[PDB]
Structures are given as C-alpha cells and as structure tokens.
Design an enzyme around this catalytic site. Structure first.
Site, mmCIF file in Angstrom:
data_model
loop_
_atom_site.group_PDB
_atom_site.id
_atom_site.type_symbol
_atom_site.label_atom_id
_atom_site.label_comp_id
_atom_site.label_asym_id
_atom_site.label_seq_id
_atom_site.Cartn_x
_atom_site.Cartn_y
_atom_site.Cartn_z
ATOM 1 C CG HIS A 134 -7.479 -2.535 -1.776
ATOM 2 N ND1 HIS A 134 -6.952 -1.477 -1.036
ATOM 3 C CD2 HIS A 134 -6.689 -3.606 -1.520
ATOM 4 C CE1 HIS A 134 -5.946 -1.927 -0.302
ATOM 5 N NE2 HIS A 134 -5.751 -3.208 -0.584
ATOM 6 C CG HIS A 192 0.286 -9.860 -2.575
ATOM 7 N ND1 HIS A 192 0.211 -8.489 -2.772
ATOM 8 C CD2 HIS A 192 -0.726 -10.170 -1.723
ATOM 9 C CE1 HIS A 192 -0.798 -7.998 -2.066
ATOM 10 N NE2 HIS A 192 -1.367 -8.989 -1.405
ATOM 11 C CG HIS A 233 -1.916 -1.162 1.133
ATOM 12 N ND1 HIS A 233 -2.602 -1.568 2.251
ATOM 13 C CD2 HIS A 233 -2.184 -2.076 0.169
ATOM 14 C CE1 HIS A 233 -3.296 -2.654 1.959
ATOM 15 N NE2 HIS A 233 -3.061 -2.973 0.701
ATOM 16 C CG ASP A 291 -3.513 -4.976 -2.944
ATOM 17 O OD1 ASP A 291 -3.049 -4.297 -1.977
ATOM 18 O OD2 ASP A 291 -4.452 -5.728 -2.800
HETATM 19 C C1 LIG Z 1 -2.926 -6.625 2.884
HETATM 20 C C2 LIG Z 1 -3.195 -7.066 1.455
HETATM 21 O O1 LIG Z 1 -2.511 -6.194 0.568
HETATM 22 C C3 LIG Z 1 -4.599 -7.000 1.140
HETATM 23 N N1 LIG Z 1 -5.186 -5.975 0.494
HETATM 24 C C4 LIG Z 1 -6.480 -6.256 0.378
HETATM 25 C C5 LIG Z 1 -6.696 -7.461 0.962
HETATM 26 N N2 LIG Z 1 -5.505 -7.899 1.433
HETATM 27 C C6 LIG Z 1 -5.330 -9.189 2.127
HETATM 28 C C7 LIG Z 1 -5.755 -9.187 3.571
HETATM 29 C C8 LIG Z 1 -6.909 -8.698 4.137
HETATM 30 C C9 LIG Z 1 -6.821 -8.944 5.507
HETATM 31 C C10 LIG Z 1 -7.761 -8.665 6.590
HETATM 32 C C11 LIG Z 1 -7.429 -9.074 7.869
HETATM 33 C C12 LIG Z 1 -8.336 -8.829 8.904
HETATM 34 C C13 LIG Z 1 -9.529 -8.163 8.654
HETATM 35 C C14 LIG Z 1 -10.385 -7.935 9.620
HETATM 36 C C15 LIG Z 1 -11.121 -7.779 10.508
HETATM 37 C C16 LIG Z 1 -12.032 -7.574 11.602
HETATM 38 C C17 LIG Z 1 -11.713 -8.363 12.853
HETATM 39 C C18 LIG Z 1 -12.362 -7.911 14.151
HETATM 40 N N3 LIG Z 1 -13.814 -7.775 13.863
HETATM 41 C C19 LIG Z 1 -14.613 -8.170 15.018
HETATM 42 C C20 LIG Z 1 -15.934 -7.416 14.906
HETATM 43 C C21 LIG Z 1 -17.041 -8.006 15.792
HETATM 44 C C22 LIG Z 1 -17.014 -7.376 17.170
HETATM 45 O O2 LIG Z 1 -17.174 -6.143 17.267
HETATM 46 O O3 LIG Z 1 -16.827 -8.099 18.171
HETATM 47 C C23 LIG Z 1 -14.154 -8.590 12.678
HETATM 48 C C24 LIG Z 1 -12.835 -8.808 11.957
HETATM 49 C C25 LIG Z 1 -9.817 -7.768 7.371
HETATM 50 C C26 LIG Z 1 -8.945 -8.022 6.347
HETATM 51 O O4 LIG Z 1 -5.666 -9.547 5.709
HETATM 52 N N4 LIG Z 1 -5.024 -9.728 4.556
HETATM 53 ZN ZN LIG Z 2 -4.082 -4.513 -0.263
#
Ligand SMILES: C[C@H](O)c1nccn1Cc1cc(-c2ccc(C#C[C@@H]3[C@H]4CN(CCCC(=O)O)C[C@@H]34)cc2)on1
Ligand SMILES: [Zn+2]
Length: 295
Positions: free
Chosen positions: A233, A260, A78, A237
C-alpha cells in the site's frame, strides 16, 4: 509509438471520504491530448478546477491534498495511483465534495471501473519524464530518492516498531500493478485513529475501507490480501504522489520511511533541478523500455 490515453467512457462512483466522512459522487470523464489529470469541485458555483500537479499540493499530513485558494480536493493518491498504473494521461475528475471516495481503501475498485469503461488511445505521443541524475531529499530519519533507470521501479522500506510485523520492491517489467499492487488497502492503528478522530479527521474510516490494527493484530475478520499488504500500500501511495509530476516516470523511486510530505519535497526538488531530468517520447513502442496493456 507510445500514445497518450484517456477514458473511452465516463466512470461514475459513489462512496465516502476517509477523513471527512462525507458522501461523495465521483465522475471520471475523457479529456483532450495534453490536458493531464484535472480535478473539479462541481458542488461549487462556479466550478473550481485543480490540475493534479505538484505545484497545487497543499496539505500533506494524512493524505495528499490539492488546493486552489480556500478550495481543497483531498485524498487524491489512491485514484492517481490507479491512473498511473493504467497509463491514463488525460482525464477530468469531478467530485461533489472535498474528498475523493475511499472505496475499499485500495485502488482496486477504481481500476475495475476504469477497465470496465475502457481506455482510448489518442493521436499524440505520450510524454515521459526520464530521470538522468540521482536526486535525494532527506528530513530526519526519512529519505526519498530518484535514481536513473531504464524502466519504472519503486522500492519502499518502513520501520514500524509494532507486533503485526517491512520492505518491498516492485519493477513493472515483471510485477503486475493490477494483481500485486492495486488491492493493497489503507491501514491505520487504533491509538492514532482515535487521535485523528479527536482532531476531526479519519471520520469515514472503518473496517469496510481500511485494515484496522490494535496493539497486536489485524482486526478485520477476513484478514489480509497480501502478506506484505502494508508495504504494498505504501508503494501504491508513492505511485499516486509521483503521478503529480504530470507525466509517467522513466526512473527508480526509493522511499525510506517517506510519507506524502517528503514525496512532495522530492517532486519539488526534481522539478527545480532541470539537469536531473528531460521529457521524452517513444515513437516506436517496440523499442521503448516500458509497455502498457491493450486499451
Ligand atoms: C489515506 C492515506 O493515503 C493512507 N494510506 C494508507 C494509510 N493512510 C493514512 C490514513 C489511514 C487512516 C485511517 C483512518 C481511520 C481508520 C479506521 C478505522 C476504524 C474506525 C471504526 N472502528 C470501530 C470498530 C469497533 C466497533 O465495532 O465498535 C475502528 C476504527 C483506518 C485508517 O487515515 N489516514
Ligand atoms: Zn494510502
């Protein structure tokens, strides 16, 4: 002439690793002509510096990771995207922990900080990598392609079997990186997110830095920034991953379900196939096929 650019002033940011959940302090500093973007783990003694180049890519699962020996810099894509979109050639990126901060999940905060600090044109021509032959890599039902094009454009197409739904094309002759790409956020799906968490990943993820999707819908109260935010998005990326070439592209990228890993294979294959590209400069900005905003 199109000149190299660095930062005019240093940028300081703090935030959390998307995967590690660690707090991290980030600094972007100016760098000399032909430095490239170089990441530095300043928590280590000595400091470990890792150029943001394709040859240093280690782990390519849920983010792009840079590696030198047993030291890593995670989730570079990012921030790299922000730097490609603003035309930053040379910069040091210091980090107090292994992972770039996720911020709001998009490149928006990085672009705002950078543009608030300002850029500095440097007295050396900007080197571009120009695609002269089509280069394609495939694995299974994923594909990633470079195509000759006098400008810079990116297309992505995802086949997600999910109710919340995608493809998009962006050509930087008309699309604004800042207004139409930079704000598109990280996203994930609840079943995967909990798998990830079970494997000690995704530890910093929350609705504060990602679009969170259950089986049916977006759970973020305030919703989506763009109607096609997810695919925008992916384009963000892809722009970050491609900047690991170490110079801006004169060409077209097309991705079909690519992540990736495949993006990195594409870069490897391109670098290797030296008949498919050459390094060019533009001694007259007025006749170049691309342009950049004032510094
Ligand atoms: C990085 C890469 O470049 C990339 N860009 C685009 C995609 N990605 C891949 C990617 C996406 C993610 C990723 C990891 C975690 C979460 C999340 C989240 C939240 C947690 C906590 N929440 C709890 C809510 C309920 C309550 O209130 O109790 C729900 C849940 C979302 C996305 O990790 N890797
Ligand atoms: Zn991303």
């Amino acid at each position: 002439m199109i000149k190299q650019r660095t930062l005019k002033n240093i940028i300081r940011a703090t935030g959390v690793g998307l995967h590690s959940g660690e707090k991290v302090y980030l600094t972007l500093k100016p760098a000399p002509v032909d430095t490239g973007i170089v990441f530095s783990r300043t928590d280590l003694d000595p400091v470990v510096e890792i150029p943001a180049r394709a040859e240093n890519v280690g782990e390519t699962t849920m983010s792009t990771t840079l590696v030198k020996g047993d030291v890593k810099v995670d989730t570079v894509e990012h921030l790299l995207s922000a730097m490609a979109g603003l035309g930053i050639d040379n910069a040091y990126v210091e980090l107090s922990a292994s992972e770039v901060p996720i911020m709001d999940g998009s490149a928006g905060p990085f672009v705002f900080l950078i543009q608030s600090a300002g850029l500095q044109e440097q007295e050396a021509a900007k080197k571009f990598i120009r695609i002269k032959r089509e280069v394609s890599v495939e694995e299974g039902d994923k594909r990633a392609v470079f195509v000759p094009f006098d400008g810079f454009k990116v297309s992505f197409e995802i086949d997600f079997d999910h109710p919340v739904f995608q493809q998009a094309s962006v050509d930087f002759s008309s699309t604004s990186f800042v207004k139409e790409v930079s704000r598109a956020r990280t996203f994930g799906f609840m079943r995967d997110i909990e798998y990830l968490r079970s494997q000690n990943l995704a530890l910093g993820g929350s609705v504060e830095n990602a679009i969170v999707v259950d089986e049916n819908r977006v759970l973020n109260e305030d919703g989506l920034r763009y109607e096609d935010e997810f695919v925008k998005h992916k384009i963000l990326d892809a722009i970050g991953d491609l900047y690991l070439l170490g110079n801006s592209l004169i060409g077209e990228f097309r991705g079909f379900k690519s992540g990736h890993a495949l993006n990195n294979q594409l870069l490897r294959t391109l670098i290797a196939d030296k008949d498919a590209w050459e390094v060019v400069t533009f001694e007259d900005a007025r006749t170049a096929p691309i342009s950049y905003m004032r510094p």
